[PDB]
Design a protein around this ligand. Structure first.
Ligand SMILES: *[C@@H]1O[C@H](CO)[C@@H](O)[C@H](O)[C@H]1NC(C)=O
Ligand SMILES: *[C@@H]1O[C@H](CO)[C@@H](O)[C@H](O)[C@H]1NC(C)=O
Ligand SMILES: *[C@@H]1O[C@H](CO)[C@@H](O)[C@H](O)[C@H]1NC(C)=O
Lengths: 224, 230, 230
């Protein structure tokens, strides 16, 4: 008799440029032929839903209802409801879900930290992280692109959001990039883009090179 | 009715300098005569539980318990079971917790702040990158010339598993400090204690003198009439 | 008729992480049918020992016995008594050994090698100086990269009180390294252990050029019109 719903975060909408509504109903009795539907605040009908998940091997039934709409409807303020109806249910339960509004809105600050000098001494690998702090809300999406070509999602893992101790309403995140030491010698800019709902373009990247953190080495002056 | 028993994490052992295991009962009604105890592999005298809770906001009753054991009798494979004889359950509830993997020495690296970060002259962040270690639950803290900092100042991160390495983990630890408190000192040695090192505890420190790789310059002067004494 | 006893040194509880008490039985006649064991002031069960020593050819009784205990029992205040009964001396000989019941943090000052040693192009000596710590009997070890070196590579000097401060001590520990291995760019950190630091473990690392950037100011003059000055 447990009902849950995962709201569509900004990190998932930015992937396919389209929001998706999902509902997770677990801790129920294993039975088939379960009707899952979505109802709006005004009762307007929703689009066709399919791709219903099966039951878990541990005697747990899970039903997922997919519904794709535009970002304007989700940002307008309309509230949805994951209605679950079945024979064993004495009454059709309801659960509302929407986008919480009324929080802070600060533009993210990207600080691409250069790799440490001692890391390159081993000549084994090199982990370049992208420090992003001072943003609201949390759960932002970051990735890496190789001269415009995105890399595989497996290489980079987004750190879990966590509130900043020195800030009342800001968060921070990390995104490492494990690459070989010999690779970061002929370019490898590794632009760190950030997805947030405060920037005018919602995307901000930084361009670096091998001689980024190293200051000038020559100061030769000519006197004539 | 579920009973949990959180094993003593390595982070709490080093900080408190004393091991302490907790085994409490949950999902129980508001009944009295609820006693708890500790049973070892063979069964001997244990420490009496103290600091009993009162109640919970969700209309339930619980009783936590702590004991005092040694550190050598934990990594040898010994098990500790907290047997609770509930009044409403004819069968006593027993929870056995113990410890068993590969061991890799952690790698400690300190990342200096970026050049563009100091241009704002608002705050400075120092990250001590720790990667390639096993198992998880590693405690990372910061100090200042031998004086430890308050736990509210520095906050560690979660032990996210390394994607490239199938059996390693990486952690992060930020330290937001003022911009003016960086060019006059504040080494902020990154002290980290792990259970896969010959010396257990290791620490590394960085400062502003780590850079400037012999920034030399040669004055090229020719066909000039200065009339001075070099 | 005197039974010696070796107190648990701080240098022995860190290298092996196992504090064990041992009382040396000497100055007695060599005979069989003897009872050697350990007793505690509390009055609980005490583990026995093994590895009985041989017989001294100079007609001197010798016996060694060690038992494995925990680490918090010695620091709590519990006393351990080693009583040995001999046929010639029926009177028991009680040997109560306990740490004194009553402190400054050590300072690691890694002295860089001089230039005269490198001029001979034979070897290089790196010493680690630690001053201002109490009490004595500390442990100094050397580690390379991520593993310790051989025990014979470095020898730790005996503790000696500071002639200036009556409540401070100092220790010395040198290390032999070739010139080629010194200019490679290694660390050769000095990690010690003390019973007063918040983490009890500290280490300091250096490099070939870690003190100052050592910038240059050389000027190249190729003008034949600018005269010189005496
Ligand atoms: C060389 O650099 C130093 C420090 O950067 C500076 O003081 C000196 O004036 C420079 N030499 C010349 C000829 O400008
Ligand atoms: C080198 O610099 C020092 C101080 O910067 C100065 O005293 C000295 O005269 C300089 N050498 C020459 C040859 O001018
Ligand atoms: C030494 O550095 C000073 C700047 O501090 C500069 O004025 C002088 O010309 C330098 N001496 C040389 C280049 O011989």
């Amino acid at each position: 008799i447990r009902v849950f719903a995962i709201p569509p975060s900004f990190a998932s909408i930015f992937l396919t440029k389209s929001t998706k509504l999902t509902c997770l109903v677990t801790d129920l009795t294993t039975y088939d032929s379960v009707t899952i539907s979505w109802t709006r605040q005004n009762g307007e009908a929703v689009k066709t839903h399919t791709n219903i998940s099966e039951s878990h091997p541990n005697a747990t039934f899970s039903a997922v209802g997919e519904a794709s709409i535009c970002e304007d409807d989700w940002n307008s303020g309309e509230r949805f409801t994951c209605t679950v109806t079945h024979t064993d249910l004495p009454s059709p339960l309801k659960q509302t879900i929407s986008r919480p509004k009324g929080v802070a809105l600060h533009r993210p600050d990207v600080y691409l930290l250069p790799p440490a000098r001692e890391q390159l001494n081993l000549r084994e690998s090199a982990t370049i992280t992208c420090l992003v702090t001072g943003f609201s809300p949390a759960d932002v999406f970051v990735q890496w692109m190789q001269r415009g070509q995105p890399l595989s999602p497996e290489k980079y893992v987004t750190s879990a959001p966590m509130p900043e101790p020195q800030a009342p309403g800001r968060y921070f995140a990390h995104s490492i990039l494990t690459v070989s030491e010999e690779e970061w010698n002929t370019g490898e800019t590794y632009t760190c883009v950030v997805a947030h709902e405060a920037l005018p373009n919602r995307v901000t990247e930084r361009t670096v090179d091998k001689s980024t953190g190293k200051p000038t080495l020559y100061n030769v002056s000519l006197v004539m």
